[PDB]
Amino acid sequence: EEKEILWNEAKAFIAACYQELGKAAEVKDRLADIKSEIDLTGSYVHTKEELEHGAKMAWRNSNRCIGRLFWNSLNVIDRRDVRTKEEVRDALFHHIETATNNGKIRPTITIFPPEEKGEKQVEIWNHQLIRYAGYESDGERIGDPASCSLTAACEELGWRGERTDFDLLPLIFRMKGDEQPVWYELPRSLVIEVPITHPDIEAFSDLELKWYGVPIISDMKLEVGGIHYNAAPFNGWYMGTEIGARNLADEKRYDKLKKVASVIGIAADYNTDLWKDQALVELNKAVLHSYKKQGVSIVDHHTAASQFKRFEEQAEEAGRKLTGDWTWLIPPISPAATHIFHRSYDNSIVKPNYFYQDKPYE
Amino acid sequence: EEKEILWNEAKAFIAACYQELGKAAEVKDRLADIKSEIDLTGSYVHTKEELEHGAKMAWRNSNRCIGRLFWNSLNVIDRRDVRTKEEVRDALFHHIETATNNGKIRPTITIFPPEEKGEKQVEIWNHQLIRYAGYESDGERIGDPASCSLTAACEELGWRGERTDFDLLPLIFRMKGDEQPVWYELPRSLVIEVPITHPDIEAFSDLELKWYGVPIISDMKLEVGGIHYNAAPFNGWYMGTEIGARNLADEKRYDKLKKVASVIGIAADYNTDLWKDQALVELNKAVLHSYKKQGVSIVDHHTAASQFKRFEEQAEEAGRKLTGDWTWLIPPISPAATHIFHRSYDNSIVKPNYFYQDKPYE
Ligand code: HEM
Ligand code: HEM
Ligand SMILES: N=C(Nc1cccc(CNC[C@@H]2CCCN2)c1)c1cccs1
Ligand SMILES: N=C(Nc1cccc(CNC[C@@H]2CCCN2)c1)c1cccs1
Ligand SMILES: C[C@H](O)[C@H](O)[C@H]1CNc2nc(N)[nH]c(=O)c2N1
Ligand SMILES: C[C@H](O)[C@H](O)[C@H]1CNc2nc(N)[nH]c(=O)c2N1
Ligand SMILES: [Cl-]
Ligand SMILES: [Cl-]
C-alpha cells in the first residue's frame, strides 16, 4: 500500500511539475526511472529542478497563506547532503543569515534529507528558528507562553534561560541514531530584533516591547510527490497583524493591550469605549512603523490583501484552481475592509503542500 | 411527498417543543389531531403556545446570530387573523411602535398567516420595515446602494423619493389575489433616528451621518414544524459594528471611511498608516456613543460576544447541541479580541429556523 501511495503521488506530481516547466515530453521516461527506483529501493530521489519547483508549488497550495503572490520567487536551498549535526547547525545558521539579508528579507527554504521508512534523518524541535522562551512557575508568567513546553524541554537538556521576556531559544534538533536532541545557542550577530516604538507617542517605548525580524517556520512537513521532507524550514517576512494583533495582543500570549491603552492615554474601563480596538490599531501602527524604521521587511494587511487579489487574478489567468481557507486569510483587524472577507474560497487540500506534524516533545 | 414532509417536520417539532415545555405526555394526542388535520386539509394550525415557542426555537437555532442569549424572551405577536391590507399595514405600524418602545427596544416578531399550498397570503417586499432608499442614475450615487432595486420598484408603483441620502422607503407588500403590491409612507412619529456624533471630536457632526434605531427584518421565512411563515418580521437591537463597520463603511454601501479620516484629522494616503483601521474604530465609537446618548438600545461587539459565551454555556448546561456559523459570528472589527475567533462551531441547520427566500422583485 505505502509503495503504491508513493507511486501514485509521484505520477501526479511529475506530470504536473513537468507540465508547468514545459517538459511534458520527458514525463514518460522520468516516470519509468522513478518506478524502477521505487521498485528497487522503496523510494525515489528528486532532481534539483523537481525539488525547487515542488517547494514552490507547495507554497502556492498553502490555503491559509495570504502571501502566495510571490510563490515563484522562493529561494530554495538543497541540503539533502547533510549527514552530521554540525552540518545541520551550520545550514540553519546560514539560512538565518541569507534569509535575513541585512533586513531585506529573502523568502527562503532549506531542505534537509527526507524521511526514509517514515524514519526521520533530522528532527527539528523548534517551532521557529528564532523564537522567545516562555516560563510558568507558580503562576509567575515570563516570556512567550506558546514556548513553555519547548522551553521546559530545553532546560531538561542542560540549557538554562535568563528568564527575561525575550530569551532567544537555542536551536534544538535530533539526528537519526541519537536518543536525545542537541542544542546550540544562536549567535546574536545573526538575529535582527526590532524595538517597538510609536511614530507619534513617545511614551510607547516605556512598554519596552520588541520582536524578531524573521519568522522561520521549522516544524512543518513539506510533501512533494509522496516524499516527506519533515525537516525543511522556510521563511517570508511578517504581516504586521501577526505581531501587533496576535503575538503581542492575545491574552494567552504577551497580553499587552491594557498596557498599550495606558501609554496611549485612554481608559480601559468600558467595552463601549472600544479601548481594545483602539489599542490594537495603535499597537499595529507601532509595529509597522518600527520595522520600517529599522529597514526590516514587513507588509501591512491592506497591501498583503491587495497582493493576494493579484494572486487570485494570476491563478484565473493561468487556468489554475484557486484554493484558500477564508478563516485564516482574513486579517485579525479590519477584515471587512479587505476583499477577502467579501468572497468565499474552496478549502480543498492540493499537494505539494506544507503540513503539521506531531511534536517530538510534549 | 409534500404532505409527508409536513408530517415528518411536524412530528419532530411537536415532540421537541412539548418536551421543552414539560408537556411530553400530550404529544401522542396532539400528533393524532395534527395527522387527521393534515389528512383532511393538507395542512395544520399551530396553537399559540407552539407558535410562540417555535419562533423562539427558530431564533435559538440561527447559526449566524451572536445575540441568541436572549432567545427565550422574544415577544411574539400572533397576527394569523389578518385578511386585509389595512390590517397588515396597521400590524406593521404597531410592530414598529411596540418594538421601538421609546428607545428601549423590545425584541419582537409579528407573525402573519403562513403559506398554504406554497401560496403566500401576504408578501412583504421590504428587506427591513425601516430602511433608506438608494439611487443610481448615470453614476450619480445617492442613499443606500443596497436599496437600489427595491427603490426602483417602488418608483414603478407611483412613489417618488426625495433623493436625500436618507429617504425612508415606504412599507410595500402584496396581498394574495392582487397583482401589484400596495405602498404606505411611514409615519415619521414612529421612526426613531440617531444623529451620529463623536464623544471627543466635534467635527464629526460635519459628516451629517445618521441611522435608524430599530432593524426590523421583514424578508426572511420563519419555518416551524413544516409550516412556512414567509411573512414574519422580527427585530432586536443593533450591534454597533453592523452600522459603523459595514453599513456606513463598506465601499458598496455608504463608503464613509475617507470622510471619517478627514474629520478626525488623519491622512488617508498610506496603507501602512492603518488609516482605515483607525477611521473604523472612531466611527464605531461614534455610533455607540450616539445611540447611548439618545437612549436607544445598542450593544458593542465585546459585550455581545460575552453574552454569546453565556449562550454557549447555557446550551452545554441544558444538554443542547450548539450550532453556529463562525464566519458570521466573528465581528468585523477586532474579531481576534473575542473568544469566538478562537474556537470552532458546528454549522448544521436545525429547525425551527429563519431562512432566506426569493425576492418578489428584481
Ligand atoms: C513572503 C511573505 C509572506 C507573508 C507576508 C505570509 C503571510 C502569512 C500569514 C500572515 C500567515 C498566517 C500565519 C498565522 O496566522 O499564524 C501565513 C500562513 C502560512 N504561510 Fe505564508 N507568508 C509569506 C511567505 C510564505 C512562505 C515563503 C511560505 C513557505 C514556502 C509560506 C507558507 C505559509 C504556510 C504553510 C502557512 C500556514 C501556517 C499554519 O497553518 O499554521 N508563506 N502566511
Ligand atoms: C436582541 C438583539 C440582537 C442582536 C444584537 C443580534 C445580532 C445579530 C447580528 C450582528 C447579526 C449579523 C447580521 C449581519 O451581519 O448582517 C445577526 C444575524 C441574525 N440574527 Fe440576530 N441579533 C439580535 C436579535 C435577533 C432576533 C430577535 C432574531 C429573530 C427572532 C434574530 C435572528 C437573526 C438571524 C436570522 C440572523 C441571520 C441573518 C442573515 O443570515 O442574513 N436575531 N444577529
Ligand atoms: N509571515 C509568516 N507567518 C507565519 C506563517 C506560517 C506560520 C506561522 C506561525 N504561526 C504561529 C502561530 C502561533 C499561534 C498559532 N500558530 C507564521 C511566515 C513565516 C514563515 C514564512 S511566512
Ligand atoms: N441586529 C440585527 N441585525 C440583523 C440581523 C439579521 C439581518 C440583518 C440584516 N443584514 C443585512 C445585510 C445587508 C448586507 C448583507 N445583509 C441585520 C437584527 C435585526 C433584526 C433582528 S436582530
Ligand atoms: C463571503 C463572506 O461569507 C461574506 O462576506 C460574509 C462574511 N461574514 C459576515 N458576517 C456578518 N456578520 N455579516 C456579513 O454580511 C458577512 N459577510
Ligand atoms: C478557531 C479558529 O479556527 C482559530 O482561532 C483561527 C482563526 N483564524 C486564524 N487566522 C490566522 N491567520 N491565524 C490564526 O491563528 C487563526 N486562528
Ligand atoms: Cl509568529
Ligand atoms: Cl442593517
The length of chain B in residues reads: 362
Strand partners, A195: A210
- Residues B166, B156: Cα–Cα separation, whole Å: 20
Return the DSSP state at B194.
E
Q: Which of A242, A299, A327 to mutate for ligand 3's pocket (most ligand atoms within 8 Å of CB)?
A: A242
Ligand number with the minimum distance to the CA of B146: 4
Could you tell me if B339 and A340 are in contact, meaning their C-beta atoms sit under 8 angstroms apart? no
Would strands B108-111 and B234-235 be described as parallel, antiparallel, or unpaired?
antiparallel
- Tell me, what DSSP letter sits at residue B342? G
- For residue B351, being part of any structural domain is answered with no
Reported as type and span, the H/E element at residue B111 is: strand B108-111
Burial track B309-337 (b if 16+ CB lie within 10 A, e otherwise) = eebbebeeeeeeebbbebeebbbbbbbbb
- Residue A161 CB neighbours (<10 A): 19
Evaluate whether residue A341 is within a structural domain.
no
In sequence order, what DSSP letters do the residues of B77-89 get, joined into one string?
EE-TT--SHHHHH
A154 is in an annotated binding site: no
Q: What's the CA angle centered on A132, arms A127 and A135, to 5 degrees?
A: 105
Given the DSSP bridges, would you call strands A108-111 and A221-224 parallel, antiparallel or unpaired?
unpaired
Which candidate from A272, A273, A333 shows the least CB-CB separation from B277?
A333
Q: What are phi and psi of A68, to 5 degrees?
A: -70, -10
Neighbours of B29 (CB within 10 A): 9
Cell numbers at B204, concatenated: 464629526
Query: What are the backbone dihedrals phi and psi of residue B239, each rounded to the nearest 5 degrees, phi first?
Result: -90, 135
How many helices and strands in chain A, by DSSP H and E? 10, 16
Cβ of B300 and A274 within 8 Å? yes
Q: Chain A partners of B332 at a C-beta cutoff of 8 Å? A: 334-336, 341
> Are residues B243 and B211 part of one domain?
yes
In this structure, the answer to whether residues B183 and B230 fall within a common structural domain is: no
Do residues A149 and A200 both lie within one domain? Answer: no
Q: Which of A303, A318, A344 is the last residue of a domain?
A: A303
Q: Strands B227-229, B234-235: parallel, antiparallel or unpaired by DSSP?
A: unpaired
Residues B246 and B226 in one domain: no
Phi and psi at A228, nearest 5°, equal -100, 100
Q: Which of B219, B187, B231, B221 has the alpha carbon at shortest distance from B94?
A: B187
Chain B contact set for A289 (CB, 8 A): 272
> Which residue from B172, B168, B244 is spatially nearest to B209, judged by alpha carbons?
B244
Ligand 2 mean position to B51 CA, how many Å?
A: 19
Distance separating alpha carbons of residues B151 and B141, to the nearest angstrom = 13
* Inside any domain, residue A338: no
A6 and A96 inside one domain: no
| Nearest in space to B248 (alpha carbons), one of B257, B261, B239 | B257
Amino acid at A261: A
Question: Tell me, what amino acid is at A95?
Answer: H
Residue of B nearest to A274 (CA): B285
Rounded CA-CA distance B80/B75 in Å is: 15
Chosen from A198, A200, A272, A308 to mutate, greatest number of chain B CBs within 10 A: A272
Strands B298-299 and B140-143: unpaired
Given the DSSP bridges, would you call strands B227-229 and B75-78 parallel, antiparallel or unpaired? unpaired
Residue B135: its H or E element: strand B134-137
Q: Torsions phi, psi of A238, nearest 5? A: -80, 150
Which residues have C-beta within 8 Å of that of residue B267, sequence separation ≥ 6? B261, B273, B275
Tell me how far apart the alpha carbons of residues B244 and B1 are, in angstroms, rounded to a whole number: 47
Beta bridge partners of A132: A168
Q: How distant, in Å, are the alpha carbons of B57, B74, B75, B290 from that of B236?
A: 15, 9, 10, 18
Task: Please report the beta strands in B147-214, taking only residues with DSSP state E, as ranges in sequence order.
Answer: 171-175, 182-184, 193-195, 210-212
Q: Residue B98's CB: how many other CB atoms inside 10 A? A: 13
Identify whether B66 is part of a domain: yes
Domains: count for chain B: 3
Task: Write out the DSSP string of B212-271.
Answer: ES--EE-S-EEEETTEEE----EE--EEHHIIIIIITT-TTTT--HHHHHHHTT---S-G
| Cβ-Cβ contacts under 8 Å, A341 against chain B | 332
Q: Which of B7, B50, B60, B68 is catalytic?
A: B68
Contact assessment for residue B116 and residue B149, using Cβ atoms and an 8 Å cutoff? no
Q: Are B128 and B162 in contact (CB under 8 A)?
A: no
What is the resolution of the experimental data for this entry, in Å?
A: 2.1
The residue whose grid cell reads 521516461 is A29
Question: Are B206 and B190 in contact, with CB atoms under 8 Å apart?
Answer: no
Distance of CA A153 from the midpoint of ligand 3 (Å): 22
Query: Could you tell me if B167 and B262 lie in one domain?
Result: no
DSSP assignment of A149-205: HHHHHHTTTT-----STTPBPPEEEEETT-SS-EEEPPPGGG--EEE---SS-GGGG
Residues of A in contact with B271 (CB under 8 A): 300, 302-303, 306
The torsion defined by the Cα of B260, B264, B267 and B273, in degrees rounded to 10, comes to: -90
Q: Are B346 and B322 in contact (CB under 8 A)?
A: yes
The pick from A63, A65, A359 for probing ligand 1's pocket by mutation, whose C-beta has the most ligand atoms within 8 angstroms, reads A65
- Closest-CA residue, ligand 1 atom 9, reads A65
DSSP string, B13-50: HHHHHHHHTT-GGGHHHHHHHHHHHHHHHSS----HHH
Report CB contact under 8 Å: B337, A249.
Answer: yes
Q: Measure the CA–CA gap between B325 and A327, rounded to whole angstroms.
A: 11
Start-to-end CA span in chain B (Å): 31
Cα distances (Å, whole numbers) of residue B179 to B173, B176, B219? 11, 8, 19
- Whether B348 is covered by a domain: the verdict is no
Q: Which residues contact A4 (CB under 8 A, 6 or more apart)?
A: none
Report the CATH number at residue A205: 3.90.1230.10
Which class for A184: exposed (0-12), middle (13-18), buried (19 or more C-beta within 10 A)?
A: middle
Q: Cα separation of B23 and B314, whole Å? A: 22
Q: How far apart are CA A252 and CA A145, in angstroms?
A: 7
Please give the backbone phi and psi of residue B128, each rounded to the nearest 5 degrees, phi first: -130, 150
**Chain centre to alpha carbon of residue B214:** 9
Contact A193, A211 (CB under 8 A): yes
Q: Which of B65, B125, B174, B183 is catalytic?
A: B65
B359 in ligand 2 pocket by Cβ < 6 Å? no
The DSSP symbol for B67 reads T
Per-residue cell: A279: 489599542
Active site residues of A: 65, 68, 237, 242
Q: List the strands of the sheet with B171-175, edge to edge.
A: B122-124, B171-175, B182-184
Q: Please indicate whether residue A299, judged by its CB atom, sits closer than 6 Å to ligand 1.
A: yes
Quote the cell numbers at residue A167. 530569551
Q: How far is the CA of B116 from the centre of ligand 1 (A)?
A: 54
Which chain B residue has its CA at the smallest distance from A300's CA? B272
Cβ–Cβ of B276/A246 closer than 8 Å? no
Residue B334 lies in a domain: no
Q: How far is the CA of B329 from the centre of ligand 8 (A)?
A: 15
- Closest residue to atom 4 of ligand 4, CA basis: B215
| Contact indicator for B34, B41 with CB cutoff of 8 Å | no
Q: In angstroms, rounded to a whole number, what is the distance separating the alpha carbons of residues B239 and B177? A: 39
Are A63 and A91 members of one domain? no
Type of residue at A79:
R
Cβ(B342) – ligand 6 distance below 6 Å: yes
Task: Among A300, A306, A333, select the one facing B272 at the smallest CB separation.
Answer: A300
* Sign for the pseudo-dihedral over CA of B139, B144, B149, B151: negative
Q: Which amino acid belongs to residue B252?
A: K
Cα(B216)–Cα(B99) distance, integer angstroms? 9
In chain A the beta strands, taken as DSSP E runs, fall at: 75-78, 108-111, 122-124, 134-137, 140-143, 171-175, 182-184, 193-195, 210-212, 216-217, 221-224, 227-229, 234-235, 238-239, 298-299, 353-355
What are residue B266's DSSP bridge partners? none
User: B285 and A278: CB-CB below 8 Å?
Assistant: yes
List the one residue out of B164, B185, B25, B51 whose CA is nearest residue B111: B51
Residues A147 and A257 grouped into a single domain: no
Cα(B342)–Cα(B339) distance, integer angstroms: 5
CA of A198: which chain B residue's CA is closest? B273
- Shared-domain flag, residues B138 and B250: no
d(CA A273, CA B142): 31
Ligand nearest to the CA of B217: 4
- Kindly report the protein residue whose alpha carbon is nearest to atom 5 of ligand 5: A342
**Given an 8 Å threshold on Cβ–Cβ distance, is A333 in contact with B336?**
yes
> CA B130, CA B91: separation in Å to the nearest integer?
14
Integer Rg of chain B from CA: 22
> What is residue B16's DSSP assignment?
H
Beta bridge pairs of residue B125: none
What CATH number is given to the structural domain containing B33?
3.90.340.10
B42 and B12 assigned to the same domain: yes
Pair B329, B69: CB distance under 8 Å: no
Alpha-carbon gap, residue B76 to B58, rounded angstroms: 12
Minimum Cα–Cα distance from A239: chain B residue:
B272
Q: Are B232 and B55 in contact (CB under 8 A)?
A: yes
d(CA B287, CA B291): 6
Which CATH number goes with the domain that contains B176? 3.90.440.10
A127 φ, ψ (degrees, to nearest 5) = -75, -45
Q: Which domain holds residue B34?
A: 1-80+107-117+221-235+305-329
At which residue does the C-alpha cell 470552532 appear? B344
Atom 14 of ligand 1 has which residue's CA nearest to it?
A242
B313 belongs to a structural domain: yes
Q: Which residue has the cell 523548534?
A: A126
d(CA A203, CA A206): 5
Q: Is A250 in the pocket of ligand 1 (CB under 6 A)?
A: no
**Cβ neighbours of A292 in B, within 8 Å:** 272
Q: What is the Cα–Cα distance from A252 to B341, expressed in whole angstroms? A: 14
Q: Are B324 and B347 in contact (CB under 8 A)?
A: yes
| Ligand 1 nearest-atom number relative to CA A239 | 5
Q: Which three cell numbers stand for residue B340?
A: 469566538
Counting beta carbons within 10 angstroms of the beta carbon of residue A217, is it exposed (0 to 12), middle (13 to 18) or buried (19 or more)? middle
Query: Which amino acid would we find at residue A35?
Result: K
- Judgement on whether residues A158 and A269 belong to the same structural domain of the protein: no
Residue B46: burial class (beta carbons within 10 Å; 0-12, 13-18, 19+):
buried
Residues B307 and B293: beta-carbon distance below 8 Å: no
Give CA–CA dist B8/B269, Å, rounded: 60
> Mutating which of B201, B241, B334 best tests the A interface, going by the most A Cβ atoms within 10 A?
B334
C-alpha cell at B336: 481576534
* Strand partners of residue A221: A355
Written as one letter, the residue type at A155 is E
SS3 content of chain B, % helix, strand, coil (to 5): 45, 15, 40
Say if A343 falls within a structural domain.
no
Experimentally, the structure was elucidated by X-ray
Chain B: residue whose CA lies nearest to A280: B334
Q: Of the candidates B284, B332, B336, which has its C-beta nearest A274's C-beta?
A: B284
Decide if A234 contacts A147 (C-beta within 8 A): no
- How many angstroms separate the CA atoms of A143 and A260, rounded? 17
Distances (CA, A) of B87 to A4, B81, B91, B94, B219: 72, 9, 6, 10, 18
Running DSSP on this structure, what letter comes out for residue B73?
G
- What gap in Å lies between CA A257 and CA A273, rounded to an integer? 14
3-state SS of A264-313? CCCCCCCHHHCHHHHHHHHHHHHHHHHHHHHCCCEECHHHHHHHHHHHHH
Distance from the Cα of residue B118 to its chain's centroid: 23
Please tell me if the CB atom of residue A330 comes closer than 6 angstroms to any atom of ligand 1: no
Q: Chain A interface residues facing chain B, Cβ-Cβ under 8 Å? A: 245-246, 249-250, 257, 271-274, 276-278, 280-281, 284-285, 288-289, 292, 300, 302-303, 306, 326-327, 330, 332-337, 341
Substitution target in A252, A281, A327 with the highest count of B β-carbons within 10 Å is A281
Examine the domain organization and report whether A42 and A98 are in the same domain: no
Rounded CA separation B64/B1 (Å): 30
